[PDB]
Design a protein around this ligand. Structure first.
Ligand SMILES: O=C(O)CNC(=O)C(=O)O
Ligand SMILES: [Mg+2]
Ligand code: NI
Ligand SMILES: [Zn+2]
Length: 331
């Protein structure tokens, strides 16, 4: 068995190996990358996502989200308070202001300490889930707006044609902006490209140990757990590395820098935070190995998790027994 300790693996594909996305995902898994739940891919030195980022300030963040925390430093929830629209130019200015800017620090480790110590006492503003792409249309390799669709993968594997589309999303972040512990919708893969700015730190639980994380979460968030059998689908719960270690939960951590891809694998729980002003782009995707995870994915039916149009068909074809109840939650 490749990568038995489930370490996060880092790949350095050549420009030749960067041509065929599917084949490279398959190669990574042949080396055991999926066991970690997360991998880093450093693109070849010849490659670029686009020529410059000099002209992005007029993108609109229609609904910036203020992330308000409750709980204790290592075990908290966050809710998202809607703010008035602002442009990326205005957001970058806000990120850099004295109130919101990254504090002086020695290194990534010092900054990680300061994040877990102090995150709960601030409410950073996140420009999340903005439909769109920053990849130049002429970028042919690993262009997140030109991947094969999850609807075509399901059709190719299973023979059934379904409605739905699959497009990327942009994330504008600042210091302390936070992504809660989650897996992807329908336990899909994700890919995330850090286009510009300051780093993003990630934590991940191996897919084979996901249920250990869920069991801890039910103990740490007991009211949430009673309210819904899959409350991590709400994307609001945070548990620190210190707390995970104290409870024997297997995990790994890695920091992503501008110009690097991350891939999360089916049923790999992940969480993390931004170091300062940045811009990431991400999309879900599927492979043949995903299908079995799709069929077994938990679902939120309490009504909070409210998800895309395109998830309907996945639940309808892969989870016909669940479909009724899950759709009652959606409607
Ligand atoms: O970048 C973020 O805020 C969150 N991203 C992810 O959870 C992902 O790419 O799967
Ligand atoms: Mg612009
Ligand atoms: Ni994710
Ligand atoms: Zn729920």
């Amino acid at each position: 068995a490749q990568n038995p300790n489930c370490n996060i693996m880092i790949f350095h594909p050549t420009k030749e190996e960067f041509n065929d996305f599917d084949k490279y995902i398959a190669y990574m898994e042949s080396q055991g990358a999926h066991r970690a739940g997360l991998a880093k891919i450093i693109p070849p030195k010849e490659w670029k996502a686009r020529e410059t980022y000099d002209n992005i300030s007029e993108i609109l963040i229609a609904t910036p989200l203020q992330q308000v925390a409750s709980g204790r430093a290592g075990v908290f929830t966050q809710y998202h308070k809607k703010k008035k629209a602002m442009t990326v130019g205005e957001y970058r200015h806000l990120a850099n202001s004295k109130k919101y800017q990254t504090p002086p620090h020695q290194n990534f480790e010092d900054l990680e300490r300061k994040y877990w110590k102090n995150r709960i006492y601030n409410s950073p503003i996140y420009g999340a889930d903005i439909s769109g792409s920053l990849f130049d249309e002429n970028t042919k390799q690993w262009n997140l707006g030109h991947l094969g669709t999850i609807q075509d993968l399901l059709e190719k594997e299973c023979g059934v044609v379904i409605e739905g589309v699959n497009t990327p999303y942009l994330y504008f972040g600042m210091w302390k902006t936070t992504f809660a512990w989650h897996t992807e919708d329908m336990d899909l893969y994700s890919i995330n490209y850090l286009h510009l700015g300051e780093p993003k730190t990630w934590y991940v639980v191996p897919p084979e140990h996901g249920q250990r994380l869920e069991r801890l979460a039910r103990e740490l968030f007991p009211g949430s757990s009673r309210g819904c059998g899959a409350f991590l689908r709400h994307k609001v719960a945070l548990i620190s590395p210190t707390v995970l270690k104290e409870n024997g939960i297997p995990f790994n951590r890695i920091t992503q820098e501008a110009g690097e891809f991350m891939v999360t694998f089916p049923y790999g729980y992940h969480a993390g935070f931004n170091h300062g002003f940045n811009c990431a782009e991400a999309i879900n995707f599927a492979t043949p190995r995903w299908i079995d995870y799709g069929k077994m994915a938990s679902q939120c039916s309490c009504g909070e998790a409210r998800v895309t149009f395109s998830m309907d068909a996945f639940v309808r074809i892969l989870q016909p027994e669940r479909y009724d109840l899950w759709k009652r939650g959606q409607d």
